[PDB]
Amino acid sequence: KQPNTGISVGLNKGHVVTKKELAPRPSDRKGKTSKRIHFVRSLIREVAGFAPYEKRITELLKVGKDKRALKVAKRKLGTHKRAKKKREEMSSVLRKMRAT
């Protein structure tokens, strides 16, 4: 994201102007919660447990069927982006569970 070259074509084209960083906004921390919210969600996970399909994912990760675990996650959740995020969450749960 270099300053514009002043030419109408090519890389970094555009009118020459002094660029500046946008002023910080409260919405910049969207997607971040307080420490209490993380504490509450962690506690409820202990009380509630895991869903049946999440149990299926972790069972596949124990036998090392990582590829099949992701396909199950995508079929359930729907998107590849959410599926691979869910698989990493199950791996993290299993990773620190086998170490206890």
Partner: protein, 147 residues
């Protein structure tokens, strides 16, 4: 204007100019563009070649502002300079006027025609054709690019 309408001249002539045999019926050849391939085939092929069929690539949500590029030719470049500035151009040959076509709502400079004789001009534009640049240079001028 009703009094000039030719139907008035046809009052008392029975058929109103549409004939006794053929008559004036409702839609004896179909409505609008009906039968373009069947009974109006000759008309379409003779007067509208290329009407039927598909050509080229689609462009979903095509915005015309992205393609905005008004052009000005070499022969019209001198007319942009104010008359009072034209006299100054002929009064001092050491300097040359700077014609920024963008200030007059033009992006690209094309090369149709010729420049005034013995008058160098510095042309400022976003884009320029090779012939336009050659004609500007051979007249003693220069080209500057902007955006």
């Amino acid at each position: 204007t009703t009094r000039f309408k030719k139907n008035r001249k046809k009052r008392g002539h029975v058929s109103a100019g549409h004939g006794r045999i053929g008559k004036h019926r409702k839609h004896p050849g179909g409505r609008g563009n009906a039968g373009g391939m069947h009974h109006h085939r000759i008309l379409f092929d003779k007067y509208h070649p290329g009407y039927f069929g598909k050509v080229g690539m689609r462009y979903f949500h095509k915005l015309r502002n992205k393609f905005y590029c008004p052009t000005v030719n070499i022969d019209t470049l001198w007319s942009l300079v104010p008359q009072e500035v034209k006299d100054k151009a002929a009064a001092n040959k050491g300097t040359a006027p700077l014609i920024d076509v963008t200030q007059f709502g033009y992006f690209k400079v094309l090369g149709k025609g010729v420049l005034p004789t013995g008058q160098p001009v510095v042309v400022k534009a976003k884009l320029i054709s090779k012939n336009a640049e050659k004609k500007i240079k051979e007249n003693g001028g220069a080209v500057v690019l902007t955006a």
